Amino acid sequence: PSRFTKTRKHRGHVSAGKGRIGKHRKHPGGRGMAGGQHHHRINMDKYHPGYFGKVGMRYFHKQQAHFWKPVLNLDKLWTLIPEDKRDQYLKSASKETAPVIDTLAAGYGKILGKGRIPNVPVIVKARFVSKLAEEKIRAAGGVVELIA
Amino acid sequence: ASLPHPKIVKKHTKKFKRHHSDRYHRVAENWRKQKGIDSVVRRRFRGNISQPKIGYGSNKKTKFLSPSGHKTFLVANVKDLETLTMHTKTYAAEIAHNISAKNRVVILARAKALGIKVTNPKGRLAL
Amino acid sequence: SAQKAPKWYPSEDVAALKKTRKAARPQKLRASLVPGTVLILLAGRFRGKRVVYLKHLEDNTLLISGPFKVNGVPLRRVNARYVIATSTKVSVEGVNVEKFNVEYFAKEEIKAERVEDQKVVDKALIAEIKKTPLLKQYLSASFSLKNGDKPHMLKF
Amino acid sequence: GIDHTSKQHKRSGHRTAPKSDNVYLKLLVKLYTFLARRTDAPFNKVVLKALFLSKINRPPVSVSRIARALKQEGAANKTVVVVGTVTDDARIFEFPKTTVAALRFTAGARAKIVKAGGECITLDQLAVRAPKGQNTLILRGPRNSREAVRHFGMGPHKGKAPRILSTGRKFERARGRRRSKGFKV
RNA sequence: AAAUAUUGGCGAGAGACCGAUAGCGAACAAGUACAGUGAUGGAAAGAUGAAAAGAACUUUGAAAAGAGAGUGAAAAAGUACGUGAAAUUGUUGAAAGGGAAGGGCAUUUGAUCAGACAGGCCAGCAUCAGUUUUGGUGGCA
RNA sequence: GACGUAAGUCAAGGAUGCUGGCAUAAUGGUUAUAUGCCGCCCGUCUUGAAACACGGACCAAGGAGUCUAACGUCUAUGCGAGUGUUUGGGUGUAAAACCCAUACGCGUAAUGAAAGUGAACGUAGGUUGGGGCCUCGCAAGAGGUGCACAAUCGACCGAU
RNA sequence: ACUAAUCGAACCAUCUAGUAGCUGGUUCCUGCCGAAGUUUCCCUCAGGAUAGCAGAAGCUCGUAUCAGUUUUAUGAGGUA
RNA sequence: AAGCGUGUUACCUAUACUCUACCGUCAGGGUUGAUAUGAUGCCCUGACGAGUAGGCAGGCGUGGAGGUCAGUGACGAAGCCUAGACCGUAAGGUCGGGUCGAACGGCCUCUAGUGCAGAUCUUGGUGGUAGUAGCAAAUAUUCAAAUGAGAACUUUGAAG
Ligand SMILES: [Mg+2]
Ligand SMILES: [Mg+2]
Ligand SMILES: [Mg+2]
Ligand SMILES: [Mg+2]
Ligand SMILES: [Mg+2]
Ligand SMILES: [Mg+2]
Ligand SMILES: [Mg+2]
Ligand SMILES: [Mg+2]
Ligand SMILES: [Mg+2]
Ligand SMILES: [Mg+2]
Ligand SMILES: [Mg+2]
Ligand SMILES: [Mg+2]
Ligand SMILES: [Mg+2]
Ligand SMILES: [Mg+2]
Ligand SMILES: [Mg+2]
Ligand SMILES: [Mg+2]
Ligand SMILES: [Mg+2]
Ligand SMILES: [Mg+2]
Ligand SMILES: [Mg+2]
Ligand SMILES: [Mg+2]
Ligand SMILES: [Mg+2]
Ligand SMILES: [Mg+2]
Ligand SMILES: [Mg+2]
Ligand SMILES: [Mg+2]
Ligand SMILES: [Mg+2]
Ligand SMILES: [Mg+2]
Ligand SMILES: [Mg+2]
Ligand SMILES: [Mg+2]
Ligand SMILES: [Mg+2]
Ligand SMILES: [Mg+2]
Ligand SMILES: [Mg+2]
Ligand SMILES: [Mg+2]
Ligand SMILES: [Mg+2]
Ligand SMILES: [Mg+2]
Ligand SMILES: [Mg+2]
Ligand SMILES: [Mg+2]
Ligand SMILES: [Mg+2]
Ligand SMILES: [Mg+2]
Ligand SMILES: [Mg+2]
Ligand SMILES: [Mg+2]
Ligand SMILES: [Mg+2]
């Protein structure tokens, strides 16, 4: 909708909102990111610290699939059970029949330990876990199986 | 007639003509705001033309009222005319300019029956 | 439709008036307007004519008859603001005046009751006028301002 | 001439109506405008003003936030009033039976409240069962948890998030961020 | 081989595109007329009327052409052709005019124009209300 | 509010009463002209323009903040710890509309150059305020609970 | 000097709508608010960024925090 | 003194002050058991109103698009002209008359190649200057007849 723009409102006004002294020009301060060390230095150092310079090791031919390790927390662990089938495990929270929660199938690599799971034994299968996540799971009465 | 109304005050009966529209033919008389830096009209120097201000606005009691005291309602056919049947004291019918002469006599005949005042009863009238 | 419609119409019911606190009280005339004074008419057909002030009427108009035999002015009404109340007086305790009122001069060739009512009043009036000399000549003559007359410094 | 102490013709700076054209919201506002005028309860005035708010000024309130509010002393039987959306929260595992009045419930939130034995209620139903806001509890979501608030007030030695698209090494982690490379912020 | 590309060629179908200073340079005998030694550069230009029915015939004139007559719904459509603006110009009529003219406020005068007798227009007086201005006179400190 | 014994009246939260003339160019509008006073040529740059600064002889038509990729703030909408059908497939009254799987993007986790590690002592903490609600009060107020947010001190995760 | 009226580097087409901190122009009305020419940095001084001045959107509350002001009390200064 | 110094009055007049009306803006409020069906409505109360650069808001107008007025129209659409009328503070809208001949509007929305006085702007057309500057180098023309509507300028003859 070009009828709602201020260009339609600036018709009849000489400078079109650009001033009579400033006199809207092509590129008064340079093109793109020019002068970031010279005359845009104050802006760059204030709002973009760390832009110039180098940081640590290069990685030739980085494949992001090597570093695939999505994180699932303990407070989201029980969501991997279907909702209709979830509550029937909360009741009768018993040993010798515990839900198996394969997090790799759901798309997760590592489990962390946000915590406060209900005290229900659950078998948890994951590529990686954290120390506190395993402590909380085994305290609730479950166990972690490592898979690959 | 119409509802009794306060006296019609216009606050400016003169047309607001554009500056120098009398000086150049290219400058149309339709009002345009002077936006020049050194404009005597924009700066409101004494002895120059007046500009449209909100202070000239018409009293809301008497706004949109003709000296007859009715509001003009543009009418295109007979069916349009009956919409002012119960509002003959406040609205007056005005036959549109593109209505043919043979339809105009039908509208005037119906308007006479309904008491609706017509602003232009002599348009396209053979004589 | 040439024009679409006004969505909501004004109410054609005309509103009643509010109660007005304006009461008609009688008019207090000027101090110089005592009955029997001689007035100078300032406007109308009888401009500059001297007349006699007879009775104050109900519609705030003075009743005058500068005697019709003397200066040809009949019973009629004048506005109190269009006359000059002079200091010269005549006695009007010889004339009946209650017969005259607003409906006496109500509109609707001279009539006959007007002529006879003029005849009864002016015989009484000229009888009183004849007492002090030169009033008859004074009323007969019309009033006019001369060059160098100053009504701000003039007294009548 | 007047020596104006304050700026003339200054608007209040507060919304007096919803910016939206939602017809149901407008007549919800119509109801509570009547209530806040003809009733002396401050609840009606607060709720009417909250109806005007924009989308970032009415953050979603989770059922876990509602349940924590009910954990307060003497608040277990109060009617939880949320002028906004009530979202679900699977983080919590027990939810009490309560009446929650809100503009919108997500499917998961409404299912969880009903499954606990509670009742999901619209703001008009709040008006019929509490015209002056008897034993209510007005909740609000976290307003400053938005992504935009991170970058607000960015400056040296402020600790705010820079506005940036790509994140990692080679992305603003250098001169101006560590004493090894020039200075540190 | 297919899935892929396609401001060229051929055949189609479409458009919230442009409408003769626009849209291709080119709606038309347009890459034409024309310019330059040359490479190249490169326009302007649509519409009478349904149908020429494109004005027979008379008269003035050397002729162009005019005036008639006539065709046509229209010649306020005559090929110098749909409508036919402005700049600028001719005629007519009105008005003003001692080194500009034009403008704004107000009124005179001239010209012109709209509505309303079931209250419209303009005023006079009296008694009040609001705001004022100008006097006379009374009692106190 | 005033007066009045009351009744009622009044100059007391804004004009009424009576009378006349005309009923049309009479008032009024428009326009031209005359008169009194005032009035420098616009646009522009400029501290400053009527300028002996610049563009403008006149008229018609054309004529200048657009679209796109990516994005910040704000707002509206849908859904909501999820969200995005339209790369594709199905289907069709066929570039429309309708329907859909697996993925993928962003978000739900951060931190470190990295290898790596990865967020509850507690009613998800204490204190100070804090709208609203509850209780006691005709009410002023007193007490309780206090979401958002503000300040501060803590606890937890990564690096050192 | 001359090299097709062109020469301190011909003419033609294209790249090319080359770039310009510089000049000129930038088209409807009304309403409300309403400036700066100063700070710091820059191969900066006809220009930018930056803080300031301004608008808009508002948000949390409801007469507090306050104030281009005085009084009282207590300091400070090295101008006339 | 109609000069100078000083004193006392009266008077003149700014878009300033006071009061009132109207416009708009802002602010605070009233209004639902017919609000005598319009709640972005109606109404009450108070204050305020300068403005370049600039910001925002509400509106006027243009080409085309979806819907509606079973809208207008050859008994005349659009266009154009009109010191003719009305409405709006204004952008503008509407009507009457004349010309004209085939299409075009109101409202709710969508969209943009959407508004001109300037740019030594582009294209085209037209003025004042102005019947003006000028049509003056190369020695030079003249008479008669013919022709023809028309002969300084053609043809022939004669002369130079
Ligand atoms: Mg401006
Ligand atoms: Mg400029
Ligand atoms: Mg007007
Ligand atoms: Mg005007
Ligand atoms: Mg200036
Ligand atoms: Mg072309
Ligand atoms: Mg040649
Ligand atoms: Mg043509
Ligand atoms: Mg015709
Ligand atoms: Mg024709
Ligand atoms: Mg023609
Ligand atoms: Mg002309
Ligand atoms: Mg002369
Ligand atoms: Mg004049
Ligand atoms: Mg008075
Ligand atoms: Mg006149
Ligand atoms: Mg002067
Ligand atoms: Mg200078
Ligand atoms: Mg100037
Ligand atoms: Mg010069
Ligand atoms: Mg210059
Ligand atoms: Mg010039
Ligand atoms: Mg144009
Ligand atoms: Mg060369
Ligand atoms: Mg360019
Ligand atoms: Mg101001
Ligand atoms: Mg440098
Ligand atoms: Mg300059
Ligand atoms: Mg500000
Ligand atoms: Mg010293
Ligand atoms: Mg010193
Ligand atoms: Mg003296
Ligand atoms: Mg202003
Ligand atoms: Mg027509
Ligand atoms: Mg035709
Ligand atoms: Mg354009
Ligand atoms: Mg132009
Ligand atoms: Mg301009
Ligand atoms: Mg030019
Ligand atoms: Mg000559
Ligand atoms: Mg010669």
Chain A interface, best mutation among B31, B32, B35, by max A CB count within 10 A? B35
- The answer to whether the CB of A104 falls within 8 A of the CB of A147 is yes
**What H or E segment, with its residue span, contains residue C88?**
strand C83-89
Method: cryo-EM
- Name B88's Cβ contacts closer than 8 Å, sequence gap at least 6: B114, B115, B116, B117
Q: How far is C119 from chain B (nearest CA, A)?
A: 51
Torsion-angle region of C62 (φ positive above 0: left; ψ -120 to 50: alpha; else: beta): beta
Residue type, C77: R
**What H or E segment, with its residue span, contains residue C51?**
strand C50-56
The C-alpha atoms of residue D15 and residue D33 are separated, in whole angstroms, by 13
Tally of domains in chain D: 1
Q: How many residues does chain D have?
A: 185
CA A35 to chain centre: 33
Is D4 part of a structural domain of the chain?
A: no
Is D174 part of a structural domain of the chain?
A: no
Question: Which nucleotides of chain E does any protein CB come within 7 A of?
Answer: 86-88, 101-106, 114-117, 120-121, 124-128
Give the CATH number for residue D119: 3.100.10.10
E-strand ranges in D63-170 read 79-87, 99-105, 119-121, 136-139
Which residues in chain B are closer than 8 Å to A13, comparing Cβ atoms?
Answer: 35
Give the domain ranges of chain B: 6-127
Q: Judge whether residue C150 contacts strand E, using its CB and a 7 Å cut-off.
A: no
Give the residue numbers spanning the domain of D85: 14-145
Is D5 part of a structural domain of the chain?
A: no
What was the resolution (in A) of this experimentally determined structure?
Answer: 2.7
Q: Could you give the 3-state DSSP secondary structure of residue D79? A: strand
Residue type, C150: K
- Name B65's Cβ contacts closer than 8 Å, sequence gap at least 6: B5, B8, B71
The C-alpha atoms of residue D99 and residue D121 are separated, in whole angstroms, by 7
Is D77 part of a structural domain of the chain?
A: yes
- The answer to whether the CB of C97 falls within 8 A of the CB of C106 is no
> For the stretch B72-97, what's the b/e string if a residue is b when 16 or more beta carbons lie within 10 angstroms of its beta carbon?
bbebbeeebbebbeebbbbbbbbbbe
> For the stretch C85-94, what's the b/e string if a residue is b when 16 or more beta carbons lie within 10 angstroms of its beta carbon?
bbeeebebee
DSSP designation for B83: G
Question: Which nucleotides of chain F does any protein CB come within 7 A of?
Answer: 9-20, 29-31, 38-47, 49-50, 58-60, 65-67, 70-82, 108-109, 113-115, 117-120, 123-124, 131-134, 144-150
